[PDB]
Amino acid sequence: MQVKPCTPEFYQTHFQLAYRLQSRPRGLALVLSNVHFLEFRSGGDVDHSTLVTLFKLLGYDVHVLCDQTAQEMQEKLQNFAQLPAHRVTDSCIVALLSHGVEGAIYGVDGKLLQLQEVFQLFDNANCPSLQNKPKMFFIQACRGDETDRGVDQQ
Amino acid sequence: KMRLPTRSDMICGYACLKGTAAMRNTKRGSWYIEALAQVFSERACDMHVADMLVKVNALIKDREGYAPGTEFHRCKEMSEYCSTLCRHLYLFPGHPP
């Protein structure tokens, strides 16, 4: 994997109408993968390595967590949101990879963590260090059991 | 002085839609992560994040399940993102050199 850098000219012509994003590191990133539980998530190891590599190449300081219970996810996400480094970085990334249901993801104990609770940890009230800074979340989890059979294109 | 809403400046990419299953290849990993890494590595230099997630959506719409003899053969998935961003989000990778 390689990330093509932006040109100096691209930066000069776009930075004024964009979020400030020039800190080094660009931000902290958290990649939290649950694979062992709800069936074993075969290929979850590939996803995890792919994102760790990607965010490192994008200039993020990457934190990793694996196979966490719902309670541990909550506690460790809160710890992550409260890190002092957020004041001096320009953005934040959180990737969560697990089984899930609409609006929640599973811990390895089969208990659910509500996504609203996750987002709240990073909001303007609870995470003042990230106020006005872009916060990215990527959620790889089912949101229901309905398989999409697909439809014919007319 | 200007105050803030309780929550703002977030963008959330979801592998699938409300009520549906997200697909994962047992060897190659999740369709959504594979697409996300392909697009972001290629385009973060000149495309903002919401626009890159649109490219991810295009890739996911096009893919289909390969799982002969199960309910997942030729199945589909659609990703989405939701945004409370108030500006373009460019990652400006490798700047300054």
């Binding site: 998530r41 089984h99 | 299953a21 290849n25 047992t26 390969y66």
Partner: peptide
């Protein structure tokens, strides 16, 4: 093969 998360 493809499976559901």
């Amino acid at each position: 093969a493809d499976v559901a998360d």
